[PDB]
Symmetry: C3
């Protein structure tokens, strides 16, 4: 019997030829795709402009205080203070200040539908000098005639008034937003006129909310710098609006050049555009993002106040070609404007290498074939897509190759399986149908028929290989006997390879000197020597070597991506030093907290 039992035994009566099989012919090998095709190009990306129009301006006004004081024993108490900003007449600004840097000590102005007027100190008019405002960090420039408050001189038990008239001139930045038909200052003072209003060009159509005479425009003007007392070298066109409280002056410039609904966001040297099922796809190596567009360009006409765009994109695409392509490529058609999801305007100039110059004609043809645009705040998804495509591309290429390389090999080896099939039809067959079988070749095809199992506790090997029947020669393979069923009548046979029990004992070789062999037998072997038995063996007790070329794949583990913000939207909010809402709220609770708004006395 068999020490080792980790195995099975079969009997393989040659197939008649009732069952035949053929080998699958070489399959059609997959073909590498002609390719996903790109278009070299330069690009300039445009985000909706969210910056206000910014420009310096200068105000001139006069703060007028009128106080009344009661005079008594020991003390003086204010009975009332009336403050006010008075706007400066056009002529004064010119003929005084920009003339001689001085101001009247009298304010004459309209207030509440009466022409009021005010004398500093109530003394008669005096031109006073303009001396700078007291020093303040992070302020533009101011100037002021006085810095004291004139109160009525003390006469007992007799109330009276003091007019003081401080002439104030400030330089202030001025901001405004689309559609640029009014602007504001740094004082909080609104001014309800376009910044580009005027007489010159079409400006007159620009918006105004004021009476016609509150605006002047000294064409050809020269500024006298209050501090330096230097006149202006080059003349401006100077705008001057007199609102109920002040006069603001500034230089006029044309609208169209001065503003734009969009901003040049990013400049891309190499911007590769593809078309992915009728949608366009520009991706940058640098910015690592990838945008998606329609196959039609976008009409700048439809863009209100988009002058800069053309001017800006062009200026940069040309600057780029010089630094990097003066030898290198060819401009296929004029620049083209696309609008990627997320509302990012895209200026693209399709290119074409130098060496391969011949194709201008080809693509040029293809390269030839209002409102407010909003831009998302996040470049996230363009990044994702970029990242996903590149990895997708690569992976899908390589594995694709592995597919074919594989197939090429499957078809290759058939040439061996053929010849191998002729050598051991038994084994080759059984490895091909994943079960043990008997087999035979009928010319070009394989006759096969099944193989019968035999209980491993039913197999018996005979001790010698020497043949009493005919001496000199020996059975080349050990002798055995076995039963199919337990109580079944014993059968006689010769051992084969892989526990194949051959019924006929014909496998014979001449007795050679010092013969010593091992044979597959159950879960292990059995050893022989000089044609006589010795012992069995564990498969383990013999040096094992492998035909298997190793490769171990490991999985790429799951990862978890907990959401994480750099700054929480409130953190940002809280960077607001003063909170307007918080203050008005607080301010407007005062009476409710500290006095009585109900009780009539």
């Amino acid at each position: 019997k068999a020490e080792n039992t980790d195995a099975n035994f079969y009997v393989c009566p040659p197939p008649t030829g009732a069952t035949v099989v053929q080998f699958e012919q070489p399959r059609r090998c997959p073909t590498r795709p002609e390719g996903q095709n790109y278009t070299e190009g330069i690009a300039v990306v445009f985000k909706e402009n969210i910056a206000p129009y910014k420009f310096k301006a200068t105000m001139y006004y006069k703060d007028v205080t009128v106080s009344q004081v009661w005079f008594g024993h020991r003390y003086s108490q204010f009975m009332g203070i009336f403050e006010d900003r008075a706007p400066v007449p056009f002529e004064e600004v010119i003929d005084k200040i920009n003339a001689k840097g001085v101001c009247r000590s009298t304010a004459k102005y309209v207030r509440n539908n009466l022409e009021t007027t005010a004398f500093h100190r109530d003394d008669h008019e005096t031109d006073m000098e303009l001396k700078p405002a007291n020093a303040a960090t992070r302020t533009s420039r101011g100037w002021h005639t006085t810095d004291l408050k004139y109160n009525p001189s003390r006469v007992e038990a007799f109330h009276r008034y003091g007019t003081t008239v401080n002439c104030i001139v400030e330089e202030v930045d001025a901001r405004s937003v689309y559609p640029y038909d009014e602007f504001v200052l740094a004082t909080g003072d609104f001014v309800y006129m376009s910044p580009f209003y005027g007489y010159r060009e079409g400006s007159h159509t620009e918006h105004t909310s004021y009476a016609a005479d509150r605006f002047k425009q000294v064409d050809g003007f020269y500024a006298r710098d209050l501090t330096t007392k230097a006149r202006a070298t080059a003349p401006t066109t100077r705008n001057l609006l007199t609102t109920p409280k002040f006069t603001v002056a500034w230089d006029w410039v044309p609208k169209r050049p001065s503003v734009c609904t969009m901003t040049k966001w990013q400049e891309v040297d190499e911007m590769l555009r593809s078309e992915y099922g009728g949608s366009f796809r520009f991706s940058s190596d640098a910015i690592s993002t990838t945008f998606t567009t329609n196959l039609t360009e976008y009409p700048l006409s439809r863009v209100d106040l988009g002058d800069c765009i053309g001017k800006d994109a062009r200026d940069a695409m040309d600057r780029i070609f010089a630094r990097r392509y003066n030898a290198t490529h060819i401009k296929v058609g004029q620049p083209q404007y696309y609008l990627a999801n997320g509302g990012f305007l895209i200026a693209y100039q399709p290119l074409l290498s130098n060496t391969l110059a011949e194709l201008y004609v080809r693509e040029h043809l293809r390269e030839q074939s209002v409102e407010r645009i909003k831009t998302t705040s996040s470049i996230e998804f363009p990044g994702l897509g970029f990242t996903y495509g590149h990895i997708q591309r690569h992976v899908n290429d390589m594995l694709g190759r592995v597919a074919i390389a594989w197939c090429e090999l499957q078809n290759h080896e058939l040439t061996l399986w053929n010849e191998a099939r002729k050598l051991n039809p038994n084994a080759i067959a059984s490895v091909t149908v994943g079960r043990r079988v008997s087999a035979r070749m009928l010319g070009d095809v394989m006759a096969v028929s099944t193989c019968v199992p035999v209980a491993a506790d039913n197999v018996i090997v005979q001790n010698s290989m020497r043949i009493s029947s005919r001496p000199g020669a020996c059975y080349s393979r050990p002798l055995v006997s076995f039963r199919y069923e337990d109580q079944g009548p014993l059968v006689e046979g010769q051992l084969g390879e892989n526990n194949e029990l051959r019924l006929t004992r014909d496998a014979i070789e001449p007795c050679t000197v010092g013969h010593r062999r091992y044979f597959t037998f159950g879960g292990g072997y059995v050893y022989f020597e000089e044609y006589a038995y010795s012992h069995q063996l564990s498969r383990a007790d013999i040096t094992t070597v492998s035909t298997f070329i190793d490769l171990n794949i490991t999985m790429l583990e799951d990862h978890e991506f907990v959401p994480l913000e750099v700054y929480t939207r409130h953190e940002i909010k809280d960077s607001g030093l003063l909170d307007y809402t918080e203050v008005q709220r607080r301010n407007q609770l005062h009476d409710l907290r500290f006095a009585d708004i109900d009780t009539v006395i």
Copy 2:
């Protein structure tokens, strides 16, 4: 000797059988995983609502100015102006304005704990018409009785007063935020009462900061549209609060339906939920994001003011099933509410295809088994995860297959290595232990023993293949001699394949007509013809063909992802036209820059 030296020589005395080896049996092939399992479902995603409650309102008030003017030679100067908004009595609004669109030319009100009163022009009471405010772009509607300022008539050297009383009515939008117990206007005016205060329902418990009589509620009210002079068709419940400065009117509505702590963010047709180690995972193809939850639903109870959620999610999930599933699937249980990291509430309806209807019973069971929620600002990580999983999944699948396909092949080919082993035990062996060796088969296993190296500058081939010893036949393989060591005694042998030096010269074939052969010999060959020598050869000088199926892997290069923002947080800030902080800062520096706050006179 040998022209070509890029090689080595060995001598392979047949192994006795001291060393034996076996072939590694077929390994256990990896098994494809039963799979990661999804659950079809529809979904509606909810971000924390950050919008204030918005609603129209109408104010009615009266600006009262009282000026005093001094009369002198040549001029008039204001000695003081006192402005004020006076709130309108409940009855006036009703019995005048909403009655007949007119207003008294007198204001009677409480101010500073005295019932002051004011006569426009000081002439006695007059009802005056309500004429629209002068035109202003981007304003709601106003109306006003007068538009002039009445100043006291000129009498010389005699001061006096003018009461003017402008009746003003405005429609204004009104905003408020959680917890909705006070609201504000577009005038900046705070009103410290819930918007949902009233007598009806439980509203009375809503917050108030005012005396009880400053509120009225004309149940069943009809608005008379000041401009059109058309009465209101359907009645409202109308709220009217009289703050110290004005009366604001609006229609009352119930709270619960009127507001929600959350907003319906996104509607997802196909939302696939998985469970990944006891955590849930819903991912959308469309939005390309993937969220992570606990395995337990979220109790809407815990959500304060979350009425809409249920109402909204339900409304859409049902609308969806119609457009896309009226034939297609089956609702497993009622909708379920999950809360993904990032605080995104998720309404999910687990589904199940039509064809496979049989499983309701199975999952339904499983589908059965306060506070303020904050939502992050960025959908970044849900996107990342989404992107990572999908690529992970795919890759890990394919390579997984490559692993098995490979293994299947390693086990396959052993069937050839077997039969091949019997044919050239020498070569097969040496390729299996990665070093040259001699070998032999002892039945089912391989007897092996080593092979000895011989200096390439020590090998000598004999010129003829014809045998003086026995003529007619020829050595089938060229004759050689060689020494092991330099000064070692020469040895005689016959050449084999791959520079194998056979000690016995027994390899013999009959001299055939016009014989011509090449033999492996050193870094190249040596050519023969008619059994006599001719010359050697470079391996290179002969047409080479390959058995190698090609595949070339390329690496996917590193990429760098420079951080890039669309808009810098300051860019956003700067989109604030007026900056409150900048202005108050500037405003509150005035005195410090332009006057003196120290010097007592």
Copy 3:
């Protein structure tokens, strides 16, 4: 002829040896890279601090109203109201309030360069108690002496004045921002002095905009809590500034400890740093991001007001090592400060496992070898990179292995192709040059020459395999005849494998009992039996089995990533309850809409 035509016929006259070929020797197998190398380490990430300095403060002031009323028949009308906040003298706050929680019913102060003064009710001075402000939700604490407005008693036709003097004390939060040289309150009131001004330490150099006597500092002060009337247990250094309108008090603390330009953003247990072409790369498993730095550390010196950084990072890195490494590793050098793109300061402590302790000496050496930093708002790209690298790494590893495993196999199998080549030189050859050819072995190389095509409509098989010429034996392969060209003279031959037409009919086997075979013949077979014809066959009509190990690669589909925001930048804006710009705009339009700013009367 041949029923099946899906095939071709060839004739293969043995090559003379004019054309010979060799097999490509084993190629050099790729070598796995020694590896990308990491450095274990702990980390703490720092975002630019955007929070203002926050600290409690307490103001003390006095609102002074002076009203005049006209007395007439039936009524009283205000002729004017003058309101004002008056600042409290240093002594009062101390010697009254913090002493005895009471206040004078008189205000004495400087206003407009006159020392005005005010008597509550005009009755003489009275100390009055400080009673809390009326209750208001979400306010800090106030207190006030009175809550009524005193108006002049009614005498007919005689105007007069009422001075009322409400003493108010508030606790208010106070905020300020870099460079911390002035701060603000919750009242909107600016205070133009550093919060850290004082006499102690170097503070005196801190900024001031006020006269020197408006500041006091009671070193060693004890607060009396107005409500509880409990004195303060521990003494403060108390700052008190008297601005023109109020006095604000607060405790002084040193600057350096009290503020920091940066904030501890994130704490990373395992932070792996690599160097990628001379740029550093720290990536976290947890936060799933990966940052990029230069190979040089960053000098904290260059960081203005960065005291906390050192203090904070150190404190946490040490806390971490305890929880997780008290046994585990070794601190290679002191902490190191790097600044990753996006301006994220990085505190890193390079570590080294315990078991492998021997390398301190090695890396320690390497670990040894002002301004305002801005931090981007988005952690996007660090995430991308993180995600991309990890997938890149993995993929590039595995496929890399597949490359080698493959190559190892290509070189392996040559050992079979060799022996196989000797068995069927015909077939092996033709599969190696991808076209049918005749072949032969000249020792160690392959003699080859071409094979000739023959029209499939030109091949004829002869019916018996029995040989009239010599009986007993049979042609082992069916007999045929064929022409090369149509009208060409017929040729005689024997069939071979794969439609090989052998010109000589020498393939012969003894007639065996009950012979039955199939032969490859055109697009199918032809069957034989007992050496006589029977019929042909379709390839399809026979059981086919495959030698091909299957593997199917599928592509990972394109995905589209539509841009998607959680909250649109305006949605955020609109979360601003009151909009300052909207209000001032609206407020400053008033006159334009409701009165006349032109018409002089």
